[PDB]
Write a protein that binds this ligand. Structure first.
Ligand code: MG
Ligand code: MG
Ligand code: MG
Ligand code: MG
Ligand code: MG
Ligand code: MG
Ligand code: MG
Ligand code: MG
Ligand code: MG
Ligand code: MG
Ligand code: MG
Ligand code: MG
Ligand code: MG
Ligand code: MG
Ligand code: MG
Ligand code: MG
Ligand code: MG
Ligand code: MG
Ligand code: MG
Ligand code: MG
Ligand code: MG
Ligand code: MG
Ligand code: MG
Ligand code: MG
Ligand code: MG
Ligand code: MG
Ligand code: MG
Ligand code: MG
Ligand code: MG
Ligand code: MG
Ligand code: MG
Ligand code: MG
Ligand code: MG
Ligand code: MG
Ligand code: MG
Ligand code: MG
Ligand code: MG
Ligand code: MG
Ligand code: MG
Ligand code: MG
Ligand code: MG
Ligand code: MG
Ligand code: MG
Ligand code: MG
Ligand code: MG
Ligand code: MG
Ligand code: MG
Ligand code: MG
Ligand code: MG
Ligand code: MG
Ligand code: MG
Ligand code: MG
Ligand code: MG
Ligand code: MG
Ligand code: MG
Ligand code: MG
Ligand code: MG
Ligand code: MG
Ligand code: MG
Ligand code: MG
Ligand code: MG
Ligand code: MG
Ligand code: MG
Ligand code: MG
Ligand code: MG
Ligand code: MG
Ligand code: MG
Ligand code: MG
Ligand code: MG
Ligand code: MG
Ligand code: MG
Ligand code: MG
Ligand code: MG
Ligand code: MG
Ligand code: MG
Ligand code: MG
Ligand code: MG
Ligand code: MG
Ligand code: MG
Ligand code: MG
Ligand code: MG
Ligand code: MG
Ligand code: MG
Ligand code: MG
Ligand code: MG
Ligand code: MG
Ligand code: MG
Ligand code: MG
Ligand code: MG
Ligand code: MG
Ligand code: MG
Ligand code: MG
Ligand code: MG
Ligand code: MG
Ligand code: MG
Ligand code: MG
Ligand code: MG
Ligand code: MG
Ligand code: MG
Ligand code: MG
Ligand code: MG
Ligand code: MG
Ligand code: MG
Ligand code: MG
Ligand code: MG
Ligand code: MG
Ligand code: MG
Ligand code: MG
Ligand code: MG
Ligand code: MG
Ligand code: MG
Ligand code: MG
Ligand code: MG
Ligand code: MG
Ligand code: MG
Ligand code: MG
Ligand code: MG
Ligand code: MG
Ligand code: MG
Ligand code: MG
Ligand code: MG
Ligand code: MG
Ligand code: MG
Ligand code: MG
Ligand code: MG
Ligand code: MG
Ligand code: MG
Ligand code: MG
Ligand code: MG
Ligand code: MG
Ligand code: MG
Ligand code: MG
Ligand code: MG
Ligand code: MG
Ligand code: MG
Ligand code: MG
Ligand code: MG
Ligand code: MG
Ligand code: MG
Ligand code: MG
Ligand code: MG
Ligand code: MG
Ligand code: MG
Ligand code: MG
Ligand code: MG
Ligand code: MG
Ligand code: MG
Ligand code: MG
Ligand code: MG
Ligand code: MG
Ligand code: MG
Ligand code: MG
Ligand code: MG
Ligand code: MG
Ligand code: MG
Ligand code: MG
Ligand code: MG
Ligand code: MG
Ligand code: MG
Ligand code: MG
Ligand code: MG
Ligand code: MG
Ligand code: MG
Ligand code: MG
Ligand code: MG
Ligand code: MG
Ligand code: MG
Ligand code: MG
Ligand code: MG
Ligand code: MG
Ligand code: MG
Ligand code: MG
Ligand code: MG
Ligand code: MG
Ligand code: MG
Ligand code: MG
Ligand code: MG
Ligand code: MG
Ligand code: MG
Ligand code: MG
Ligand code: MG
Ligand code: MG
Lengths: 138, 124
RNA sequence: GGCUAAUCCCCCAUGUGGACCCGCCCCUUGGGGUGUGUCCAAAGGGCUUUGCCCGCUUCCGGAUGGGCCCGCGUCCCAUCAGCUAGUUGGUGGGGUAAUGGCCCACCAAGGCGACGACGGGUAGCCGGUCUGAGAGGAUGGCCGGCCACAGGGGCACUGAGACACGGGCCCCACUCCUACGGGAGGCAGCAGUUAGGAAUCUUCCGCAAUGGGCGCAAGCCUGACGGAGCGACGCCGCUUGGAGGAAGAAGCCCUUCGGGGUGUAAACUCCUGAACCCGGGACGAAACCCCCGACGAGGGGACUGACGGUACCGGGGUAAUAGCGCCGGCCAACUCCGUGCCAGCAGCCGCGGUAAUACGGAGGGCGCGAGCGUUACCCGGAUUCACUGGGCGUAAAGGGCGUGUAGGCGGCCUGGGGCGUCCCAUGUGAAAGACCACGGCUCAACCGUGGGGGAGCGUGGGAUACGCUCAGGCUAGACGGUGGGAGAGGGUGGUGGAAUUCCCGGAGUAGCGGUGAAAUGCGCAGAUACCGGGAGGAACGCCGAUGGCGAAGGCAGCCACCUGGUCCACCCGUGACGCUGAGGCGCGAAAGCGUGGGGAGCAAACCGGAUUAGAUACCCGGGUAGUCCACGCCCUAAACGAUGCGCGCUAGGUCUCUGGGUCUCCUGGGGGCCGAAGCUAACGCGUUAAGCGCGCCGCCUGGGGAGUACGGCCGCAAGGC
RNA sequence: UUCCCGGGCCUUGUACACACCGCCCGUCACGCCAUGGGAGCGGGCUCUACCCGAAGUCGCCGGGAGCCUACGGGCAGGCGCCGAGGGUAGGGCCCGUGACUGGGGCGAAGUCGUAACAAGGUAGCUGUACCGGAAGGUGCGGCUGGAUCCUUUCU
């Protein structure tokens, strides 16, 4: 079994991008999908699609990088520089709306799960709600 | 350590041992000399270093340093002990305060005289 | 012993009302109403006495103040692990304003504890305060709130209230009086004395103000309080002058003897005018009271100041305290002289044995300035107990290994609940402090007015993503089924050959053995070397590996039996049944212990021999425990991969053991070696991670002291934890 | 070209860098400091069992055994429980002094060993066991955190 599917997905993405894959497969869950949807609305990924693999559902996540570079090391700037869990099983983290973090002077994002649904910090503030602090991404 | 573990166990606050049992930490303590002796410092230093063994109002017998160029201490001299150690002498944890009680200030001391306990000359 | 008054005490009455028993009703813990019976009231005084004032009695309500009860929060040691007989509960009493094991009788046998009971140590708690970027740490003086105490221990009495600081009883210690019988006392009130201490004030003024007690009031009391005094203890404000004044005096210092510095500094000129003298001189004080009204409302009027002849204002008017630390680096400020590992300095590294910017003085300089330093202590820096925010291959740090208890954690889909979580409203979050604004003292400190903020908790409403929960479903985790493997995995039994030793026999003779060389030893009672036979114990060559198995310790001839784990294929069954695991329990090399066996070879101890400056040590000869078996202890280790377990993710290449496959090869599972990305102080690690992540456990926090001491638990002991 | 002396180059181990005429561990001596054990003695606390027990509240008596009486009762007084504190006996912990005794740590650095660091001149380390006054030596087993392909002093 897998103790933290959300952490697992975030990590699959990290791991995949660090070797510059075009895509990775994360096992499929609705919640994961909502997170992806935020990422793909926010520009960190090209997008994702539901995919069957050995008869089981997966989410194929299409990765996205920068231009190729000069000098030694042509490797591209990552679009996801940082992707990190906050709340984990074993320490859960809930912020009130006044406590929603502001990630990297607004250049980054935090992703909260709220009773109004999964939101970015900006969405959540405008919506006036707090929630579980899932991950931060920049 | 896991969060669970911190929850079960927690960090230990780190207690601080005192460098000076002048007993109830007092800025100073009064005592009387037992011995006024000279003692020889450790390796890369040579000198006759002036020192006094004091019985204290605390009920403590300690070893003090007698700073300055020369001293009037001896025998049953009453004295005030201020703490702080001489580095290069083993087991001397406190200083004697010049200018208080039976220890006079340093004769003919022009530069910093509030240490060494001597008063201001008249310019002649 | 005698007299006597009252707002002192009692008796009957009146009963608005109220208290109690019993019933009834509504209400729901003992709240409200009602009926009958019983029971319960009072005090008088003043006036201008013909009506007012001051009071008295019962009751209902208000206001304020309190008692009791519950949730939650509130320091260190587990070297404190079990605590408990009013103990835990029940019925009935007693007690109280009132619930209660608060107390008592009887009955039951419970209550509490690893979410730390019981024990020990320390400690009044809080608003706040200090520090800190914050989280946090530390603290609780003064001011405000609560508690507790009044020489120590007990107890009640009187009251609305006390179990009473300046009230009472008793015991104890102490001081004093004492006709020796016996008495008096209680500054943790204001001052003040004394002792202890590094150290902490005046036996001041006033009742004027605010506040309090009694009084109809007039008024009395008030060391509360308003003030003044003392102490740079703190903070704030202020002075020791201002403008001019030399290519620049004298003195002192440095000098390359040319000069440089102190230095516009001084002198001097001019101006201002702290101190000081003279004069005026406060606010804080308008109520209580008087007048009209109506002893109201309303209106009007007069008395009162400790601080103080103070602050302040006006006039006059003198150039009129500066010190303290530092100048090697950290750290802002350098030269001369004296000293010569001395004298000394020192927070750390360090400086001083002849050029010392580090000692001591001087000149000069830096920093602050009515202060400047020192010691102590708190936070800081210290992300050096790491929530924010650390770690464990070799630096401290993975438990010797497992099994599993408690606990922590938990795949995919749907539905109910809405405990966590989030949002709104509301109540609370006193005052002071902090923040912001405006204001009052000439400013400020200080103060006033207003505003904002605020975690947490109560109540009502709402949201459902995530966590929880209940209900249902799935199969990717886990387990199972069938079939097929490899294996020093374990236990019992048997058995085979080589070799050593010894015993018997044959043949044979002069040594063998051993070392660097020797010698002790063994051999003419015939050894060694050779052949045959026998006994016995221990261990299994080749195969054999850079191999295999096990969780670790560890496992190696062959055979059989009993038994554990594991891998692959098929995709058949169950349907999250999972991971981890404090404690517990079990296993745990060698040595070691107990009882009994065994005993070939080896061999601690021991007995000997040459070495050789000695020798107990390295070499040689012998040799006991032990090594082996049974059973029972011991529980260590470089028990090592010095690397906890599980899961997911991130290039390859190469060698290899073991399955499957359509068998250059592909696809599982082990063992190795190089290397992508990445990581690491580096060495190195790198799909067998030391990479990226989640879960859980164990552990570390400078080196010695020391795996010591003390304590506890375990052990026969050794000794272990 | 083996050996002696001096030297050059590559490499390897090192705890040396005042650089092997090095370093450290250990021992005896001297001085200082703190502490462990500890007979015995001094005081303190606490628990249990039994005995004594003030004040006071409460309970019972309150009687031709006292006082008041409206005869209802009240007060004095008496007895009891509880009870501060004291005594006896024992159990447990804390403080003080402490004969005798254990190691420890500093410090002039002198004495003596030569154990470890280089293959440290017997590879080291290690658990345990015996011997030794100790340094250490040996046995059994283990680890690599071992160099490489006569016994040889101190500086
Ligand atoms: Mg790709
Ligand atoms: Mg899409
Ligand atoms: Mg990242
Ligand atoms: Mg966080
Ligand atoms: Mg909250
Ligand atoms: Mg900002
Ligand atoms: Mg020196
Ligand atoms: Mg009379
Ligand atoms: Mg009469
Ligand atoms: Mg009536
Ligand atoms: Mg009546
Ligand atoms: Mg009356
Ligand atoms: Mg009457
Ligand atoms: Mg009248
Ligand atoms: Mg009330
Ligand atoms: Mg009892
Ligand atoms: Mg009872
Ligand atoms: Mg009752
Ligand atoms: Mg009770
Ligand atoms: Mg609990
Ligand atoms: Mg306790
Ligand atoms: Mg206290
Ligand atoms: Mg405290
Ligand atoms: Mg601050
Ligand atoms: Mg700050
Ligand atoms: Mg901190
Ligand atoms: Mg704070
Ligand atoms: Mg506190
Ligand atoms: Mg005080
Ligand atoms: Mg107070
Ligand atoms: Mg008391
Ligand atoms: Mg007193
Ligand atoms: Mg007393
Ligand atoms: Mg008392
Ligand atoms: Mg009263
Ligand atoms: Mg009183
Ligand atoms: Mg009293
Ligand atoms: Mg009291
Ligand atoms: Mg008094
Ligand atoms: Mg009183
Ligand atoms: Mg009296
Ligand atoms: Mg008395
Ligand atoms: Mg007083
Ligand atoms: Mg004194
Ligand atoms: Mg005063
Ligand atoms: Mg007076
Ligand atoms: Mg008054
Ligand atoms: Mg008044
Ligand atoms: Mg009076
Ligand atoms: Mg006062
Ligand atoms: Mg001037
Ligand atoms: Mg001059
Ligand atoms: Mg001068
Ligand atoms: Mg000149
Ligand atoms: Mg003038
Ligand atoms: Mg006035
Ligand atoms: Mg006035
Ligand atoms: Mg008055
Ligand atoms: Mg009138
Ligand atoms: Mg009026
Ligand atoms: Mg004037
Ligand atoms: Mg004038
Ligand atoms: Mg002047
Ligand atoms: Mg320097
Ligand atoms: Mg500075
Ligand atoms: Mg400097
Ligand atoms: Mg000298
Ligand atoms: Mg100095
Ligand atoms: Mg200091
Ligand atoms: Mg000279
Ligand atoms: Mg000189
Ligand atoms: Mg020098
Ligand atoms: Mg100098
Ligand atoms: Mg200095
Ligand atoms: Mg100097
Ligand atoms: Mg000032
Ligand atoms: Mg600090
Ligand atoms: Mg910090
Ligand atoms: Mg530390
Ligand atoms: Mg952390
Ligand atoms: Mg660290
Ligand atoms: Mg090491
Ligand atoms: Mg280590
Ligand atoms: Mg291990
Ligand atoms: Mg263990
Ligand atoms: Mg397990
Ligand atoms: Mg479980
Ligand atoms: Mg759960
Ligand atoms: Mg789930
Ligand atoms: Mg739901
Ligand atoms: Mg809710
Ligand atoms: Mg406030
Ligand atoms: Mg102003
Ligand atoms: Mg707060
Ligand atoms: Mg609320
Ligand atoms: Mg609510
Ligand atoms: Mg719903
Ligand atoms: Mg289910
Ligand atoms: Mg299977
Ligand atoms: Mg099978
Ligand atoms: Mg087959
Ligand atoms: Mg086998
Ligand atoms: Mg087998
Ligand atoms: Mg077998
Ligand atoms: Mg044979
Ligand atoms: Mg023969
Ligand atoms: Mg023989
Ligand atoms: Mg012979
Ligand atoms: Mg012979
Ligand atoms: Mg013969
Ligand atoms: Mg013969
Ligand atoms: Mg033979
Ligand atoms: Mg034979
Ligand atoms: Mg035999
Ligand atoms: Mg072999
Ligand atoms: Mg092997
Ligand atoms: Mg294994
Ligand atoms: Mg092994
Ligand atoms: Mg099998
Ligand atoms: Mg199926
Ligand atoms: Mg099914
Ligand atoms: Mg366990
Ligand atoms: Mg064992
Ligand atoms: Mg054994
Ligand atoms: Mg045996
Ligand atoms: Mg035996
Ligand atoms: Mg032998
Ligand atoms: Mg010889
Ligand atoms: Mg010899
Ligand atoms: Mg020799
Ligand atoms: Mg031998
Ligand atoms: Mg190993
Ligand atoms: Mg270990
Ligand atoms: Mg780890
Ligand atoms: Mg095959
Ligand atoms: Mg493989
Ligand atoms: Mg490698
Ligand atoms: Mg690389
Ligand atoms: Mg890392
Ligand atoms: Mg590198
Ligand atoms: Mg490298
Ligand atoms: Mg992997
Ligand atoms: Mg591979
Ligand atoms: Mg792994
Ligand atoms: Mg690492
Ligand atoms: Mg230490
Ligand atoms: Mg041990
Ligand atoms: Mg202990
Ligand atoms: Mg012991
Ligand atoms: Mg025993
Ligand atoms: Mg041992
Ligand atoms: Mg023992
Ligand atoms: Mg040579
Ligand atoms: Mg050459
Ligand atoms: Mg080299
Ligand atoms: Mg090297
Ligand atoms: Mg080595
Ligand atoms: Mg060195
Ligand atoms: Mg001793
Ligand atoms: Mg002792
Ligand atoms: Mg009694
Ligand atoms: Mg009595
Ligand atoms: Mg009572
Ligand atoms: Mg009667
Ligand atoms: Mg009585
Ligand atoms: Mg009794
Ligand atoms: Mg008693
Ligand atoms: Mg020595
Ligand atoms: Mg030797
Ligand atoms: Mg050795
Ligand atoms: Mg050696
Ligand atoms: Mg050796
Ligand atoms: Mg070695
Ligand atoms: Mg050994
Ligand atoms: Mg011995
Ligand atoms: Mg030896
Ligand atoms: Mg031996
Ligand atoms: Mg060995
Ligand atoms: Mg080694
Ligand atoms: Mg070899
Ligand atoms: Mg030899
Ligand atoms: Mg030699």
């Amino acid at each position: 079994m897998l103790t933290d599917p959300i952490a697992d997905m975030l990590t699959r993405i990290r791991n995949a991008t660090r070797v510059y894959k075009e895509s990775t497969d994360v096992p499929a869950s609705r919640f994961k999908e909502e997170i992806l949807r935020i990422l793909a609305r926010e520009g960190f990924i090209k997008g994702y699609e539901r995919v069957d693999v050995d008869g089981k559902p997966y989410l194929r996540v299409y990765l996205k990088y920068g231009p190729r570079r000069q000098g030694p090391d042509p490797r591209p700037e990552q679009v996801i520089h940082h992707i990190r869990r906050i709340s984990k099983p074993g320490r859960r983290v809930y912020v009130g709306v006044k406590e929603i973090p502001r990630v990297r002077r607004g250049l980054g994002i935090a992703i909260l799960s709220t009773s109004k649904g999964v939101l970015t910090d900006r969405e959540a503030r405008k919506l006036g709600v707090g929630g579980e602090l899932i991950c931060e991404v920049w | 350590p896991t969060i669970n573990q911190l929850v079960r166990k927690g960090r230990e606050k780190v207690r601080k041992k005192s460098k000076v049992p002048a007993l109830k930490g007092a800025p100073f303590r009064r005592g009387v000399c037992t011995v006024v002796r000279t003692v020889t410092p450790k390796k890369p230093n040579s000198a006759l270093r002036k020192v006094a063994k004091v019985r204290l109002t605390s009920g403590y017998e300690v070893t003090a340093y007698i700073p300055g160029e020369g001293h009037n201490l001896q025998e049953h001299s009453v004295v005030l002990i201020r703490g702080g150690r001489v580095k290069d002498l083993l087991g001397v944890r406190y200083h004697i305060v010049r200018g208080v009680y039976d220890a006079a200030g340093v004769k003919d001391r022009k530069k910093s005289r509030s240490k060494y306990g001597t008063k201001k000359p008249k310019e002649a």
